[PDB]
Design a protein around this ligand. Structure first.
Ligand SMILES: [Ca+2]
Ligand SMILES: [Ca+2]
Lengths: 286, 73, 161
């Protein structure tokens, strides 16, 4: 593996960072906002397809000049600010309308889209600061209780999050051990310990505090961290409808929400690390 | 420099009418604000790298849509 | 105006369930969502100093946040809860303009002295959920009620109440 990180100005044309994507507009997400990674002093942002470019703090930096050929609006900006973050925001609803569907494509480059001239652009590197990709797996070992007068169900199971954060990487020699593990502390508590973003989650329906057992969040030097927790949690079940008891079919919905927005982390892929529902000895009530 | 709050840092006056006139227009805006300020100086955008000012005396805040949801100056 | 007028805090409350009613002890356990929203210019900040636009304090009560940062905040209470309520997803986040908002999905067991089961089962009862502010009317006042969500939730099933 080849190592990246921080330690203690030629041939910049080949390392062109330019990439594009297509988007869909509907429902509430009429307004679109995208970030970008830190840039070199000489980098100039070209925006092509209203739209506006500000910094991370929202201070306006550039607007778009409407050139009729190619339709839409063309925007361009440059700055020499060293460590800073830039944001591009596009609004598609300047007036009240029925709408219901909109197809849109953009052209984005951090130094020179003119050199690439759009096209397939294989060597382009995405510069939208894309959301981290966290896989999630959940298994149910038992449904220990169902309080049907209070409409809740207590369930035991295992949960496993796995995400790659390069900023979380470290030199293995500084601590000796290869994997850095934070035991019996929630993801939020670990994010408090080390001032870094982590995909804190919640069950969105639990009443009272769940019993977390064997929970540990361990990080690998490459940066692929993973969190494991055997929970015993009492979820709330409004969807219970016992009007047809005992011939009823019920939905036990265990919903793991992320306490961070879709900008930061998103549940990419469900992980079948273990049988989703466990088979145990006995007829069992449910 | 910024101490507290969201504050964004010849003859002197306070033409606040230009603010309302610019707000009346459909908010280029930075260029027009710069031109009006020159007709009537530098601004700050970050902590630790505030833009400096060059002055020469031979004889004796800003506006921002700091929210990222809806662009409103 | 130079009277240093009390801050205007809007409040919204929604009820998702009435999970329990202990009628011998005269209490009712209710789950719901609560959302406070107030504008405090002194709470504003420069967005660049921390990078993120909104400054959020997670899973900590308004009083705990007021302890963390030595500023006045509209700490509230339920005025009738027995025991400690279960606060879920509670977060207080501040916008650089200064408009802060607090959100909390509570599961709280309120006390109901007003229960009068002398006409059971033909009785009509009042479930009174009273959010008091722990600051006087000089500091903060509940200005406007916010209908951010349906006040009483509709859920599948006949339900007891
Ligand atoms: Ca129900
Ligand atoms: Ca069994």
């Amino acid at each position: 593996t080849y190592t990246t990180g921080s330690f203690q100005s030629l041939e910049i044309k080949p390392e062109a960072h330019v990439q594009e994507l297509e988007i869909r507009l509907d429902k509430d997400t009429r307004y679109l906002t995208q970030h970008t990674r830190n840039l070199q002093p000489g980098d100039t942002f070209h925006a092509l397809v209203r739209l506006r470019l500000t910094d991370s703090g929202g201070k306006p930096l550039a607007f778009g000049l409407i050139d009729q050929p190619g339709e839409s609006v063309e925007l361009n900006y440059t700055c020499d600010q060293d460590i800073c973050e830039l944001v591009v925001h596009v609004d598609g609803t300047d007036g009240q309308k029925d709408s219901g569907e909109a197809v849109y494509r953009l052209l984005v480059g951090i130094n020179a889209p003119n050199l690439r001239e759009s096209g397939q652009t294989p060597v382009g590197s995405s510069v939208f600061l894309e959301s981290d990709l966290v896989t999630v797996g959940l298994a149910v070992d038992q449904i220990v209780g169902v309080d049907q007068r209070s409409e809740n169900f207590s369930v035991v199971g295992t949960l496993k999050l796995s995400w790659h954060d390069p900023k979380l990487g470290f030199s293995p020699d500084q601590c000796g051990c290869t994997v850095k593990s934070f035991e019996d502390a929630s993801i939020r508590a670990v994010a408090g310990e080390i001032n870094l973003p982590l995909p804190s989650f919640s069950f969105y329906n639990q009443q009272g505090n769940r019993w977390s057992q064997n929970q540990v969040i361990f990080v690998t030097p490459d940066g692929r961290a993973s969190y494991f927790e055997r929970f015993t949690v009492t979820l709330q079940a409004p969807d219970f409808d016992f009007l047809a008891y005992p011939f009823d079919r019920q939905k036990f919905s265990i919903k793991v929400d992320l306490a961070v927005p879709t900008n930061m982390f998103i549940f990419n892929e469900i992980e079948r690390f273990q049988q989703v529902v466990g088979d145990q000895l006995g007829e069992e009530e449910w | 420099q910024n101490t507290g709050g969201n504050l964004d840092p010849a003859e002197e006056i306070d033409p606040a009418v230009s603010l309302g006139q610019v707000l009346e227009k459909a908010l280029d805006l930075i260029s027009e604000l710069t031109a009006v300020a020159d007709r009537i100086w530098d601004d700050d955008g970050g902590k630790g790298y505030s833009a400096s000012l060059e002055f020469t005396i031979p004889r004796d805040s800003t506006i921002t849509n700091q929210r990222l949801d809806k662009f409103q100056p």
